[PDB]
Amino acid sequence: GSSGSSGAGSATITYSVLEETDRGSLVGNLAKDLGLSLRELITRGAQILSKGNKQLLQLEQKSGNLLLKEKLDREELCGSTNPCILHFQVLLKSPVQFIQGEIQLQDVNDHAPEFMEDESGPSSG
Numbered sequence: 001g002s003s004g005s006s007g008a009g010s011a012t013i014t015y016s017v018l019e020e021t022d023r024g025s026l027v028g029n030l031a032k033d034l035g036l037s038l039r040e041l042i043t044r045g046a047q048i049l050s051k052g053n054k055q056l057l058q059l060e061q062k063s064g065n066l067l068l069k070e071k072l073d074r075e076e077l078c079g080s081t082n083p084c085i086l087h088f089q090v091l092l093k094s095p096v097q098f099i100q101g102e103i104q105l106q107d108v109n110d111h112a113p114e115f116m117e118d119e120s121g122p123s124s125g
Contacts, residue, residue, distance in 0.1 A: 013101035015066065016108070019077075019084065023070045027057065027103065030090060031064025038064055045093035050086070057088055 015028035030048075031041040041064060048057035048066060056077075058067045078084035086103030 010100050011102040012099055013090075015086075015101070015103040016106050017086075017103055018106040019072065019074065019079065021068055021072055023068050025068050027066035027068060029064050030059055030066060030101075031061075033064075036064075038062065044095065044097065045091075047091045049089040049091050049098075056086070 013030075013033055017025070017027045021027070030046060031038050038061065041059075042061055046059060046061065048055060048059045050056045050069075054069065056069045056072065058069055059065070060067055073079070077086055084105045088101055088103065090099035090101055092098065
């Protein structure tokens with residue numbers, strides 16, 4: 001059997017946060033993101049990996065919320081530059097595991113219509 005081939009995409013998670021994010025601001029949910037439980041995140045010790053020395057993130061690991069270390073700067077990360085995405089990774093302990101998350105800039109400006117969803121019905125004849 002054979003059926004062509006294709007598939008790409010490194011980023012697994014994408015967060016939303018401005019650029020002037022204040023220190024101690026909730027970037028997003030990690031344990032709730034993957035839909036995992038704090039415990040699971042705790043057991044596997046889930047932390048934020050940003051930069052070699054001094055991290056710009058700190059997962060309290062209490063409610064699964066990404067906390068900023070300090071007040072960002074600009075150039076340090078991106079500052080204007082595009083796409084302007086933070087570079088981080090979720091570190092896990094035995095079983096040691098790592099993820100390739102991402103931080104998208106708060107580019108909220110669409111909203112779009114939405115209101116619940118539920119559809120399903122086959123057809124044939």
